[PDB]
Symmetry: C6
Subunit: 221 residues, 6 copies
């Protein structure tokens, strides 16, 4: 990737095999839990689109998820095509060619071209745009891999409030729609979907309290 050397140059180097093994092991062990998204966003810091394609083609399993991806980046590139038309002109003096939707990905673009693209001033973040598309696809993937909607989590007979909140926020992280609506579920359905005694003590405390307060109040029975 383009690493910032103190001398003042950004030259790509081959991605360390350590990073590839880390990404692979994360994909297998952690399956497609919501943390794979920050894992990818952290392991792909400054990576080129070719490096991102390498990291995507590295995993062997979950071919349905990878096909959903290969479709999602395809749709994103198609949308970028309609957002960004062709200048329809020759090469201007001292000017490089504008990347297209396919050129944003590593398919129709050489590593030298991508390096010049992301190092020339003003800089264009082709790798960052590819990362954004991949993250958008991973959102749909992690949504599909969660077989439970937000309005199905209810506290069991003697299930601890701690693990109830744990499962509730697992599913909240899995289900992404917005922010205000997430707060909407957070401040009602947390108490709305509890045991009878937990319900009673939660409205004994009433509204206008913090989640820490709810858990320390519902510490026992």
């Amino acid at each position: 990737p383009i690493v910032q050397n103190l001398q003042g140059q950004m030259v790509h180097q081959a991605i360390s095999p350590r990073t590839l093994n880390a990404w692979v092991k994360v994909v297998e062990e952690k399956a497609f839990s919501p943390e794979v998204i920050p894992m990818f966003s952290a392991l792909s810091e400054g990576a080129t689109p070719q490096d991102l394609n390498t990291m995507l083609n590295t995993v062997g399993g979950h071919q349905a998820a990878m096909q959903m991806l290969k479709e999602t980046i395809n749709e994103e590139a198609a949308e970028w095509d309609r957002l960004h038309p062709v200048h329809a002109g020759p090469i201007a003096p001292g000017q490089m060619r504008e990347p297209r939707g396919s050129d944003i990905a590593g398919t129709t673009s050489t590593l030298q071209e991508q390096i010049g693209w992301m190092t020339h001033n003003p800089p264009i973040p082709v790798g960052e745009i590819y990362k954004r598309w991949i993250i958008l696809g991973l959102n749909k993937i992690v949504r599909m891999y969660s077989p439970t909607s937000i309005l199905d989590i209810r506290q069991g007979p003697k299930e601890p409030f701690r693990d109830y909140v744990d499962r509730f926020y697992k599913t909240l992280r899995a289900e992404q729609a917005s922010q205000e609506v997430k707060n909407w579920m957070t401040e009602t359905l947390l108490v709305q979907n509890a045991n009878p005694d937990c319900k009673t003590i939660l409205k004994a405390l009433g509204p206008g309290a913090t989640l820490e307060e709810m858990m320390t109040a519902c510490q026992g029975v």
Copy 2:
């Protein structure tokens, strides 16, 4: 993070995947024992707020604890807003914009802005303030994860004095309120909550002795 090169420049580099795996394994294996706090404070040496957010979003489990966090940094940012108002003016010549409570975290701030913030002279420790807020939240988290107050530890029938002191200082580390009060429990309840024979020999020694003296006196029965 900002590493001090001998040349005289501080330029961020991508956090090593080794550090991320170390933090993850610590979080899973060591759960949320009090040592996770120095673990975080050591693994986040010089890290940017974006790196801290990456390390926080890395862990998948303990979503209740992570929600307590996301609430605690929210409260800390809100407090910082009321401590630090807006200058309400244009950009001064050769002067950058003052970070806000949200800008302190990596949400509403770019990596370039954070780097300029923590490298311009005079330097402002945005990453250190974010670390302080995260540590303040981890204090509450480790307090909640300990289901035992300080005034519940009592020596068993034939439980060794060594393991009694071990459990006592586990719980003392877990329960944090102050320093003088910690010494207050340390110098009384250590002996106040012992076996009858241990009680007798401890006041046979009397007060004004060291913990080493207590343990070497209570080495046997």
Copy 3:
């Protein structure tokens, strides 16, 4: 391999033993699944033909596959011989000798000669051509190791649509012929080779839909 130092020179260094162990472990554990091809293409970034030969001779098992390789690079070199004849002349002033089919591989070529070949301006990618031949052979190897044609995958009695699509795209990745024909299977045989109820609901949705739509429609029975 030839690593681009910021000073402006490309000098070969000994391949790290880490890379060799990574390649070996990939070959053994992952057998010859289609992901070994991007594994090789990533672990051999900038590697010399001698390094590629080292990586090929490293693996001990699958000697039938390695013989298929040693035959495929032989055929590729023979084809390159007939594509590229001999200039049949002495050495021109300030001009090096043109590599042959055997010289492209590391057999009849010294490391110094290869380095001069891939560092002199204009540059010739002898290592890249060797990589291309090895990848062409690995295509045939991965095709042979897959004992199932594309027109044999059919959904079982109560096999989930997710795992059906998984196996279907395993076999699609294994079987490579072209691109338009891959889309041809993708848009028909995916639904053509399903359970009766899945068939009914898939043509209930009809054509002109995405794979994500097919899977979310066939989420249940």
Copy 4:
């Protein structure tokens, strides 16, 4: 820690997570055997007092031992206070403030102050003094963790002389009082605490012999 770069500067860098994991694993697996002392002295080469405090707070278990430590460094700092009074004067031109007993540890001292302390000429070894105090405490800790005095080791019925000497020198290393007295036990109690037949052959050899001679003579019965 302060690493000596060839350029001629000593600038602190963040301690590697590898060193922290090594120290932690040593503490857990090797418990508090006498080798943990050279382990600490080797892993803390050039470390700052803040790094030493991080390494001390890293371990979670053995809180009784850590309290003995926190007491021993407290006593050492108090002794250093009475050895080193306050100059009771303003700051001299081009002169820094003298560290105190608490400032020697990382509690009341910033990393910048410690760096200036251990890099200014003439240099003051604040980190080395902290290391010496920690080692003095670890001496008492390893003494307490050994539940056996030197005058209790006696050769069993058919216990080999090799393992007898092994256990004897385990306990000798555990019990530290001086050097001349260690030689005193070494040259008598080694033979004084043996089996009857071993006694007979040892005084058959007589005094004025080496430990190698004793073991090769007592190789058999």
Copy 5:
């Protein structure tokens, strides 16, 4: 080993313990399969004769094989003595002494002398000659460790053609005599030593076909 720094100097550094552990683990786990030869040739890139001697003395087991080695390098050095006589003269101005058969190995030669030998212009490859002798000995070792001649491999009753070819090329790699004779076995005994039905279909295809063709024809029964 002599690593080529970009500055323009070749100075030996201590071999990494990682390389030694890699060589050791390869020797133990992989025994003496034919791949240990490319393993050694890759792990000993640029190594000095002293480094090669260290790597040879590192392994503890297979002392019969190591004695065969110590004999083979002895014979190679003796042959080099008779190939290269003594100049029988004093030291010429600005000229170093010519290495002998023993001086080629690290026995009678200091590291400084070897470094000057392999860094002075014109360069002499003492380490490469030692590597060649060690490889020649490893050839005999791997031949001895294979307890099966080439004319003993015959396809079993229902042994797959894949594994038959696997074992055949295992033994072909183990048995090294030449190249033309290897092709001689390759193109006849592959089919000559098969099951009756495999024989029939192989001569149904006839000669003038590739090994890939043989295996895809004999895919089934």
Copy 6:
């Protein structure tokens, strides 16, 4: 240790924890087999006497062996004292003090003094002399740990010649007296201590043959 930087300076750096863990694991797993000697000689390349003392004090077990060591370096230092007397004079202009037997080890010598000793021109190899003494002690240690003389190895009833030679050269490596006498055992007792049938075929071949010839002749019964 003193690493040769290309700039032209030799400055000690803290020994990597990797080297310490490697030495420790070698000592525990491989016990004290003869290969621990080249292990130590390879892991202690360029190490200072203080580093050697750290590596020696690192191991916890085998205190009898470590006491034999601490005695052997003591005897070596005492011998060096009688070989090298005191100059009995003041410090000469621009001249450092001559190391003594104790100063050769890291006991009575500071790291700065040792660095100046092994970096000043002309250089004195204090670390190398300490390494030589430690190796001399390890010779005696590995001799003691081998409970079998050279004249006890005899081929069993149906023990393979390969494993017979293996055990024979294990014990030959363990028992070190000289070189000519080692050849003396090598060329007779190898055949002198065999099975009756092996005896018959070995003198069927007769003398004047190589060990490879003996093993290939005695391949079978």
